[PDB]
């Protein structure tokens, strides 16, 4: 049972890596996008 | 009887050994702490929720604009390890439960953010 | 009586941890689905960035 | 704080579409509906702060309707989920069901099957537990498990088909529950699934299908040959073939002594016993 | 609710690029492709609600192609994932594979090797079970694991890739992948299996010294495998092939089965080793 | 597919800042740098589809540099991480290090990548000192972020590398921080103290662990540590070896413990000589 649990947890390590990375990239892209909409609002005024 | 005692000693040796081996429960739990910290992702997701609120308001405005003894000792050590292994099964179950609820929350939050971003992108497309 | 107690304790740890196997099942599928979502989220974030940039340029 | 009744009143005034000659001079009615929806959301927020949860749900429903009129269907789905949360925390199961149905329709129309399935499952849970509409709960679990099986989410779909099969078996649809258990087995290749399949077959008085299920389980994965569940299924099949209900009850007691029979198993075994006893009475 | 066939016809009518004089006065064709893509998506959501999964998948493929023509490659990949979804659920494995191929190409083209690898693994799974395309599935698993390396999905993919390679007659390369798995997983249980499997692959390649050194490596490097009944089994297999006595080999297989049931992979490899002893028996006369 | 070489060439041609009189009529040079970066990213993608990974990394470095001139530092950091990936997959560890250093500078994420940088320094380049620095600094960055478990991983790596590097006292101090796995931390602390000819501090570490943590009190590790302290106080190197073999028999000594135990034995034998 330990073997099955540890191996499966070995598998889940990539999911955790990918999730951290993907959400991190998304956060930065959203930050840039919000900044762009801020500058756009500044211009339309 | 000497043969039976020899077989018993051999099997207690193997038993202690496998018990030590399972005691993998550590690499699992240590890494689960590692990935627990990685899922605490949640920080990024909260920040996106705030920043999508900001995007909503901005873009809305944009649109508006001897042999016996060895058996005994091996059983002693097997007991010690097995007690500790029981603790590890209990705690691993607990941590999986907590992380499962956390992952469900992460799940719903990420999809909500995905939808809100598609919404804002579409409404930016028409401006 | 010690050996029987040890056997019982081992059996109980086996039970707890069979349940753990099922729990990490649910966690593993959870992690696959969440990977697909954050993949989607990264796409949508990049697209939102690009659309906001394009509106910023159009208006400028 | 603003009065939520006042906010809803202003929302209703703003939510009137431009009719007649005024339609030629008024811009798109979308903006009016957006503003009415924002006002309704504000009223819902104020109600939720006042723990007047059902009123908050109603205000969210009005907001979602205005959002649908505005063309912002995704906003409407999210607001229906908010109305849902308010109703469920308020114990108003019926309005909660309606909110999830609207939201799931919006989500499925937009290709968001994952969210639609999550909420269709929660809808099934509300139908099963608070409203006891077991049929529509079965339908919810089936449809949403299919939606997950599309997304490759095997473990979800398996939970879903477990719930669907359990409710079907409790509802007397033994054959269909056994078929769903076959799907679960195939997707998981589990001991519990083999046992439950066989039990459904016994409740359908088809001991031959139960024996084939036992042999399949024994052959395809070794953990079944040696499990208590396989032995118990064999023993039940033997009792059913022998038409002797007391032996079946003894086997149930033994198995209860080593692994507690949950409520579902007790029900199925009771109906199997009833079929045996009915056959015994019919032969006298 | 609109007729999906009418929506598809409208999309096809709108999907014609501007040609000749009208192109000088008509704006970018991106808008027309966007409209066709939206409309095919609507028609497909309709088909999909009717459980007509194959038609929904075909409409998804059409919309994805139109989106590719529109320049929105990410949305084309998402629509390909939808096409895949309805094809696999509809039992059409080949069209599901085609969607996976288009999707993965888009994804690697966008720097998203991750998703490409996940969907390459799904593609290899579909190939192995439904279409029995073993070589191309082997390639898919290898590429998925490589991109994953670029730890665990790669470890999983390498396990399956080595499994298919060894069962397919390619013992040496499967053993090399098992060595890669050993090196990546060192520092445990997966290792306990790896050493045995590597030895089995090399013993199927008639290199008894290779199985011997593999077992010795497992014994010296991994204390677990050193003590594991897998190591004693691999020693016993090595001995039985060394003496060239198929009977003791058969008894060792039975003994191994009695306590841990043997898997189809190991049965095929050990049957190949026994049949190699029978080829040796022919090599005697 | 476009030729990546031509895309790069177009990127440099666009990437020339406006000089002299033309600067008065040209808008912000940011847009030119953005377009050159886009061309470089395209070239990097094309190389990377070809498995010409090092060229893809170089193109990403050029793109990140153009992004830095544009003022889009966040994109520069992401692109440096892309260049890093290409180099690490390409076996070019030096350019991978350079990429993470630049990226961690922009980010200061910095802790995640500073740890990965430490791993490259440790395993591929064997620059143990600056890897130790990486682990220390990035564990501190986690400690600020209240990520205890990660920071503990970091200080484990830092302390192990320090102890292997002869900095026994500093490793013992990091083990004190890690204590404040616990049984293992106690053992390692004592061991470093023994490598510093510090038997009394080992005795106190043992006493601290025994009194404060019951699981360590009765553990094999505490028993091993007392036996080692007793041998060291006795100047009895063969007894130390015997205890080591016993503990190896019941609990395999990893390479780190073996190295430190050999150092302790050598210090005893040197006092004997």
Author numbering:
A (entry chain K): 213 to 257
B (entry chain L): 433 to 455, 457 to 473, 475 to 499, 589 to 650
C (entry chain J): 27 to 86
D (entry chain I): 1 to 189, 198 to 292
E (entry chain G): 1 to 150, 154 to 190, 195 to 292
F (entry chain H): 1 to 108, 115 to 186, 197 to 289
Could you give the paper's own sentences about this structure?
SNARE (soluble N-ethylmaleimide-sensitive factor (NSF) attachment protein receptor) proteins drive membrane fusion at different cell compartments as their core domains zipper into a parallel four-helix bundle. After fusion, these bundles are disassembled by the AAA+ (ATPase associated with diverse cellular activities) protein Sec18/NSF and its adaptor Sec17/α-SNAP to make them available for subsequent rounds of membrane fusion. The disassembly requires multiple ATP hydrolysis events in the presence of Mg2+; as few as six ATP hydrolysis events are sufficient. The side-loading and side-release mechanism explains how Sec18/NSF can disassemble SNAREs with constrained topologies.
We chose the Sso1–Sec9–Snc1/Snc2 complex (referred to as the ySNARE complex) because each component of this complex crosslinked with high confidence to the D2 domain of Sec18 (Snc1 is highly homologous to Snc2). In the structures of all eight classes, Sso1 is threaded through the D1 pore of Sec18. A characteristic phenylalanine side-chain density in Sso1 is present at the same position relative to Sec18 in all classes, allowing for reliable indexing of Sso1. Protomer F, with no apparent density for nucleotide in D1, was not associated with Sso1.
